[PDB]
Every structure is written in structure tokens, then in C-alpha cells.
Amino acid sequence: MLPFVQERIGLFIVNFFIFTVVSAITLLVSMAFLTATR
Amino acid sequence: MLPFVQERIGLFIVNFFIFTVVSAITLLVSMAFLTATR
Amino acid sequence: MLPFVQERIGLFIVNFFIFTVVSAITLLVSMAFLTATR
Amino acid sequence: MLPFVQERIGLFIVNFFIFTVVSAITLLVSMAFLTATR
Amino acid sequence: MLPFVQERIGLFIVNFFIFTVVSAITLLVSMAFLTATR
């Protein structure tokens, strides 16, 4: 009922989650941009 | 009155919040850039 | 004197702080790039 | 068995981990883009 | 010997650290890209 259950397994979620997004932006941009320019 | 109430529900806010921004930058840039180039 | 005072109000700082930066990069880049290309 | 073991060494993982990604996006994009444009 | 020493001063490291990187990517990209295009 009380708060403070787990944090170790939580902080890992955001860390790995941001990696997936930060990759999509650099890879997706390169594909769309490279196709337009070239 | 004392601090330390909840952290689990907090760390999730930033995680999901950054996802929305990191997406807007890659999608918004692609739209404006692709239109200019093409 | 002892550590562990507040974390809830802290984690919110980085969350909102990153939003301001991630916006400047997408908006600033679009302005400089769009002007050069167009 | 109980939760809450370590957080100091954890928060450092994401901090340093994001640095490696945020660098790959700016360096990788510059290489692919600069080659196409030039 | 036991864990849990400080977190307030830690969470601030990543917050300020990411700012320095997120700036280098937008400023470095603008310099290299603007020079190539223009």
C-alpha cells in the first residue's frame, strides 16, 4: 500500500527506452534526407 | 509534511515525456526540410 | 546534515529542462537550414 | 530479497549511456549528409 | 559501507551533462551543414 517499491528496475526503463528513440530519429532522418538530396 | 512520497510514478513521467519531444524534432524537421529540398 | 532530502522536485527539473533544449535544437536547426536551402 | 539496493551507480549508467548515443546521431548524420551534399 | 548515500547531487549531473551534449549536436551540425549548403 505504501510507496517506494522499486527504482533500480525503473531507471533502467527510461535509459533503454530513450536509446530506441534517439536511434529512430538519426536513422529515419538519414533515410528521408539522403533520398531527397541524392 | 515530510519529503519522499513517490518516485516510481515520477521517473515514468520524464521517460514518456521525452519520447513525445524526441519524436516531434525528427518528424517536424523531416517535414520542413523535405519540403524545402524537394 | 544527512543526505536524502528531496527527489520528487528534483527529477522534475531535468524532465522540464531537457524539453527546453530538445526544442531549441529542432527549431534553431530548421531556421538556419531552411534559410540556407531556400 | 527486499528492493532498494543501489541508485547512485544506476543513475550514472543512463547519464553516460545517452552521451554515446547523442554523439552517434550528430556524427553519423554529419558524415552521411555532408557526403551527399558535397 | 552500505548503499544509498546521495541522489540529489547525482540527478543534477545527468541533467546538466545532457544539456552540454544536446547543444553540441545542434551547433556542430549547423556549422558543418551550413558551410556545405552555402
Curated annotation (Swiss-Prot), chains A, B, C, D, E:
Family as reported in the entry's similarity comment: Belongs to the betacoronaviruses E protein family.
Record note on quaternary structure: Homopentamer. Interacts with membrane protein M in the budding compartment of the host cell, which is located between endoplasmic reticulum and the Golgi complex. Interacts with Nucleoprotein.
Organism: Middle East respiratory syndrome-related coronavirus (isolate United Kingdom/H123990006/2012) (MERS-CoV)
Virion surface side: 1-16
Name this protein carries in UniProt: Envelope small membrane protein
Gene that specifies this protein: E
Section covered of the full-length record: 1 to 38 of 82
Transmembrane portions of the chain: 17-37
Function field: Plays a central role in virus morphogenesis and assembly. Acts as a viroporin and self-assembles in host membranes forming pentameric protein-lipid pores that allow ion transport. Also plays a role in the induction of apoptosis.
Protein localization: Host Golgi apparatus membrane
